[PDB]
From Swiss-Prot:
Residues where ADP binds: T50, G51, G53, K54, S55, S56
Protein name stated in the entry: ATP-binding cassette sub-family C member 8
Gene designation: ABCC8
Membership in a protein family: Belongs to the ABC transporter superfamily. ABCC family. Conjugate transporter (TC 3.A.1.208) subfamily.
Protein species of origin: Cricetus cricetus (Black-bellied hamster)
ABC transporter domain segment(s): 14-246
UniProt topological domain (Cytoplasmic) ranges: 1-246
Binding-site residues, ATP: S152
Amino acid sequence: LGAVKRIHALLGKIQIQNLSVRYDSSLKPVLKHVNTLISPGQKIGICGRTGSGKSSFSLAFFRMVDMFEGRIIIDGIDIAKLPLHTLRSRLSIILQDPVLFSGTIRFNLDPEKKCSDSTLWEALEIAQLKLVVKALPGGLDAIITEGGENFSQGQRQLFCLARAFVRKTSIFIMDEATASIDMATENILQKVVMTAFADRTVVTIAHRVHTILSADLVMVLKRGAILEFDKPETLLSQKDSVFASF
């Protein structure tokens, strides 16, 4: 009866306007009066804290919370008025480290269950993954045993990128790698990011200013507010906090 009591104990245009949010509502607002606008096809870098707006940027994109004040619009519509499951289902995420299921490669590459194997494999060709897909032992039918640990970090990154491509997202969210890969592979990865972000809205969670020197735009955050946003050369010319981080 203690065990049953344990069982009972078991139960593409984007603009932010003046958005404030706090999970606690007590310690501090997470973001305070953030304002910026991203045109379709712009490559946008978010800089400031690591995870207060890596996480606040991602959390707002995933709609993990509504704002306390202000509004967040996606494609001209306030995110408080969209079906959350439809929103998140219509949003593709490719992070630096992707978690995969202990199933087939094809099955690991289906978070879009009605995709045909041909369209997925073709999508991997478009998203430059088909070569390493083909050189997996069973190709598309290769069981991703141990949740994807027989693939490299880079090959997993490509897989995640194709997984975004297959979902035909309007907007991309990319988690910047915390380590290096190679010169030809990080260089390729950046080329893939450039092609992905071509004609599309790109949200880069930036931490290092080292990579973001060829971002179309960098958004610099301080104490929960966006104080400045521009391109890297101009931000370096500003000589402020982002220039000190650059």
